[PDB]
Amino acid sequence: NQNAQALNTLVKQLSSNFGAISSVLNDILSRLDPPEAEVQIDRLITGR
Amino acid sequence: LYNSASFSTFKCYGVSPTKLNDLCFTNVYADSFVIRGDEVRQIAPGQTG
Amino acid sequence: SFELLHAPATVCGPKKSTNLVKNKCVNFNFNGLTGTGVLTESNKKFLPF
Amino acid sequence: AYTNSFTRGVYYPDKVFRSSVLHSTQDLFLPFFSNVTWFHA
Ligand SMILES: *[C@@H]1O[C@H](CO)[C@@H](O)[C@H](O)[C@H]1NC(C)=O
């Protein structure tokens, strides 16, 4: 049960933004220029 | 619109203008008005004038 | 002004669609919804909205 | 004129289809066992 709970928390953490506009970085990359996309991507990477 | 080469300012905020043709949106608004030249910069978020 | 909300997209980026291939590892973007995977006919039911 | 609303008045807060989950969402709903009117006509 402990292993399952930890793994479920880890997988749920992929649904957060950590301050970026969107949780999924596919959308970030699909509607932003790389110089401006990298700003969001940095926050998302730190959060993960 | 991007390649019209006749628009003084075209800056986008949420998106990238070059990638804009590839997106897909729920709905879009369109406002139109006439202003002078020295307050176009006032049309921006977090701006006072 | 654009927006990203839960209702299905109405005004969308104009570019030619294609066919769809199943049971293959392909890249796709369903009217904005972009991803990569194996497209397979499903057995679940969707409320028609 | 004043009847009690039982466990009733809940809608689908979104469209993302889900099955066999226990999804939680904060939105506007009828509180369970609320004091509702009985306008008679
Ligand atoms: C609903 O409101 C009325 C207002 O007078 C009150 O008399 C009644 O007791 C309330 N219902 C319940 C279940 O308390």
PDB file of N, CA and C in Angstrom, chain B residues 15 20-30, chain C residues 1 3 5 7 9-15 31:
ATOM      1  N   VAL B  15       0.354  33.872 -27.272  1.00  0.00           N
ATOM      2  CA  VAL B  15       0.868  32.916 -28.243  1.00  0.00           C
ATOM      3  C   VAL B  15       2.033  33.512 -29.012  1.00  0.00           C
ATOM      4  N   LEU B  20       0.681  30.911 -34.661  1.00  0.00           N
ATOM      5  CA  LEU B  20      -0.728  31.193 -34.430  1.00  0.00           C
ATOM      6  C   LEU B  20      -1.621  30.485 -35.435  1.00  0.00           C
ATOM      7  N   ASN B  21      -1.142  30.295 -36.661  1.00  0.00           N
ATOM      8  CA  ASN B  21      -1.959  29.654 -37.681  1.00  0.00           C
ATOM      9  C   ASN B  21      -2.245  28.194 -37.365  1.00  0.00           C
ATOM     10  N   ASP B  22      -1.432  27.564 -36.524  1.00  0.00           N
ATOM     11  CA  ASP B  22      -1.552  26.143 -36.239  1.00  0.00           C
ATOM     12  C   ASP B  22      -2.391  25.841 -35.007  1.00  0.00           C
ATOM     13  N   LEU B  23      -2.761  26.851 -34.229  1.00  0.00           N
ATOM     14  CA  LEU B  23      -3.535  26.616 -33.023  1.00  0.00           C
ATOM     15  C   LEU B  23      -4.987  26.316 -33.370  1.00  0.00           C
ATOM     16  N   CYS B  24      -5.818  26.238 -32.337  1.00  0.00           N
ATOM     17  CA  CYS B  24      -7.217  25.865 -32.513  1.00  0.00           C
ATOM     18  C   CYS B  24      -7.963  26.331 -31.274  1.00  0.00           C
ATOM     19  N   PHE B  25      -8.890  27.274 -31.440  1.00  0.00           N
ATOM     20  CA  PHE B  25      -9.409  28.039 -30.317  1.00  0.00           C
ATOM     21  C   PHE B  25     -10.905  27.826 -30.130  1.00  0.00           C
ATOM     22  N   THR B  26     -11.340  27.967 -28.878  1.00  0.00           N
ATOM     23  CA  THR B  26     -12.758  27.824 -28.561  1.00  0.00           C
ATOM     24  C   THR B  26     -13.571  28.970 -29.148  1.00  0.00           C
ATOM     25  N   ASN B  27     -13.123  30.204 -28.933  1.00  0.00           N
ATOM     26  CA  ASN B  27     -13.823  31.376 -29.441  1.00  0.00           C
ATOM     27  C   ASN B  27     -12.855  32.549 -29.441  1.00  0.00           C
ATOM     28  N   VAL B  28     -13.159  33.544 -30.270  1.00  0.00           N
ATOM     29  CA  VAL B  28     -12.285  34.697 -30.446  1.00  0.00           C
ATOM     30  C   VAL B  28     -13.129  35.961 -30.512  1.00  0.00           C
ATOM     31  N   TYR B  29     -12.668  37.004 -29.834  1.00  0.00           N
ATOM     32  CA  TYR B  29     -13.309  38.308 -29.855  1.00  0.00           C
ATOM     33  C   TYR B  29     -12.568  39.234 -30.812  1.00  0.00           C
ATOM     34  N   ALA B  30     -13.173  40.390 -31.078  1.00  0.00           N
ATOM     35  CA  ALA B  30     -12.568  41.368 -31.978  1.00  0.00           C
ATOM     36  C   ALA B  30     -13.123  42.744 -31.645  1.00  0.00           C
TER      37      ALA B  30
ATOM     38  N   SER C   1      -8.884  38.685 -29.022  1.00  0.00           N
ATOM     39  CA  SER C   1      -8.774  37.989 -27.750  1.00  0.00           C
ATOM     40  C   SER C   1      -9.213  36.545 -27.928  1.00  0.00           C
ATOM     41  N   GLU C   3      -9.253  32.406 -26.054  1.00  0.00           N
ATOM     42  CA  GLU C   3      -9.422  31.777 -24.754  1.00  0.00           C
ATOM     43  C   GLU C   3      -9.297  30.267 -24.890  1.00  0.00           C
ATOM     44  N   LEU C   5     -10.794  27.185 -22.956  1.00  0.00           N
ATOM     45  CA  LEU C   5     -11.796  26.733 -22.005  1.00  0.00           C
ATOM     46  C   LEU C   5     -12.306  25.357 -22.420  1.00  0.00           C
ATOM     47  N   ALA C   7     -15.145  23.954 -23.400  1.00  0.00           N
ATOM     48  CA  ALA C   7     -16.029  23.642 -24.509  1.00  0.00           C
ATOM     49  C   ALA C   7     -15.218  23.294 -25.755  1.00  0.00           C
ATOM     50  N   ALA C   9     -13.582  23.360 -29.374  1.00  0.00           N
ATOM     51  CA  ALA C   9     -13.131  24.486 -30.178  1.00  0.00           C
ATOM     52  C   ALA C   9     -14.072  24.720 -31.352  1.00  0.00           C
ATOM     53  N   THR C  10     -14.291  25.992 -31.678  1.00  0.00           N
ATOM     54  CA  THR C  10     -15.171  26.384 -32.769  1.00  0.00           C
ATOM     55  C   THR C  10     -14.419  27.000 -33.939  1.00  0.00           C
ATOM     56  N   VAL C  11     -13.638  28.047 -33.695  1.00  0.00           N
ATOM     57  CA  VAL C  11     -12.801  28.650 -34.725  1.00  0.00           C
ATOM     58  C   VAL C  11     -11.404  28.052 -34.594  1.00  0.00           C
ATOM     59  N   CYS C  12     -10.902  27.465 -35.675  1.00  0.00           N
ATOM     60  CA  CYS C  12      -9.729  26.615 -35.582  1.00  0.00           C
ATOM     61  C   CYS C  12      -8.770  26.927 -36.722  1.00  0.00           C
ATOM     62  N   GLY C  13      -7.503  26.565 -36.519  1.00  0.00           N
ATOM     63  CA  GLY C  13      -6.464  26.825 -37.488  1.00  0.00           C
ATOM     64  C   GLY C  13      -6.723  26.164 -38.827  1.00  0.00           C
ATOM     65  N   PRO C  14      -6.706  26.957 -39.897  1.00  0.00           N
ATOM     66  CA  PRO C  14      -7.023  26.438 -41.233  1.00  0.00           C
ATOM     67  C   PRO C  14      -5.819  25.778 -41.886  1.00  0.00           C
ATOM     68  N   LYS C  15      -5.865  24.455 -41.992  1.00  0.00           N
ATOM     69  CA  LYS C  15      -4.916  23.714 -42.809  1.00  0.00           C
ATOM     70  C   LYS C  15      -5.524  22.358 -43.126  1.00  0.00           C
ATOM     71  N   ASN C  31      -7.453  18.448 -34.007  1.00  0.00           N
ATOM     72  CA  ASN C  31      -7.938  19.822 -33.909  1.00  0.00           C
ATOM     73  C   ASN C  31      -7.384  20.558 -32.696  1.00  0.00           C
TER      74      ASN C  31
END
